[PDB]
Structure 1
Amino acid sequence: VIKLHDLKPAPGEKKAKTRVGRGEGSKGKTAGRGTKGTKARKNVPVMFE
């Protein structure tokens, strides 16, 4: 019989959150931003070239 502990999300339904800045074995020490620039502390507008 189907109880609450039998319920599971479907495969691929749930992907783990990527946690940046949590070590160099992951997206660590820059969070995929690279080193410097405007793009290292802010985001650049799309309306700007």
Structure 2
Amino acid sequence: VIKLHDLKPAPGEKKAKTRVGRGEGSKGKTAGRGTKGTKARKNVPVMFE
């Protein structure tokens, strides 16, 4: 008799979110952006060369 606590997502379904800028153990002080530039703070439009 399956009850509500017996329910479980299929293996491989749920991936953990990557929380960034939460220490130097994973992704810190730049959050995967590298050093300065345009790309260090905003973006570049896809139609720009």
TM-score normalised by the chain length of structure 2: 0.93
1:31 shift after superposition: 0.8
- Is the partner of 1:39 in helix, strand or coil? coil
1:4-49 Cα shifts (integer Å, max 9, x gaps): 1011111111000000000010111111000101111001111001
Distance 2:13 2:7 in 1: 13
Structure 2 counterparts to residues 3-22 of structure 1, below 5 A: 3-22=3-22
- Write 1 or 2 for the structure with the bigger share of helix: 1
Q: How many residues matched?
A: 49
Distance 2:40 2:12 in 1: 32
- Is the partner of 1:44 in helix, strand or coil? coil
How many percent of aligned residue pairs carry the same amino acid?
100
Segments of 5+ residues of structure 2 without an aligned counterpart are: none
TM-score normalised by the chain length of structure 1: 0.93
Segments of 5+ residues of structure 1 without an aligned counterpart are: none
